[PDB]
């Protein structure tokens, strides 16, 4: 079941899975980890997730390990930095690359090592 908010369609998975694994779901439903692109859709995305932890689109890119949307978004360094629970990312053991929605707070995303597993959150577009 597939929910709707402006103008994209979001799958929260019941099944837990590394973030990659988790693309390569998504990727198979025609859509991509979720993006974060305005105070509205991380309010959504965070009320929808209730209190539990889903991996989302955050990555990194680059050599100076600047963070990325994976759905190719262009990520806003000065526009998402509200976005963060206070303190991170911190890159924990230097081996947090991919980012999830973990407070049900505005302040919501937390670095965590990729190869962890947690449940996720695709997002599609509607064409119409
Ligand atoms: O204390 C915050 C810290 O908690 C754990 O160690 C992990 O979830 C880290 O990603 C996070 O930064
Ligand atoms: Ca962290």
Redesign the pocket.
Known sequence: GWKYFKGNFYYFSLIPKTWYSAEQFCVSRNSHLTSVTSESEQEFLYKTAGGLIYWIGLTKAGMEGDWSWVDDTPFNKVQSARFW?P????N?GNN?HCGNI?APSLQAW????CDKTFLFICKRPYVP
Do not use: F, L, R, S
Not at 87 to 90: C, K
Not at 110 to 113: L, Q
């Open positions: 629970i303190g991170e990312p911190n924990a947090e973990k937390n670095d965590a090592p």
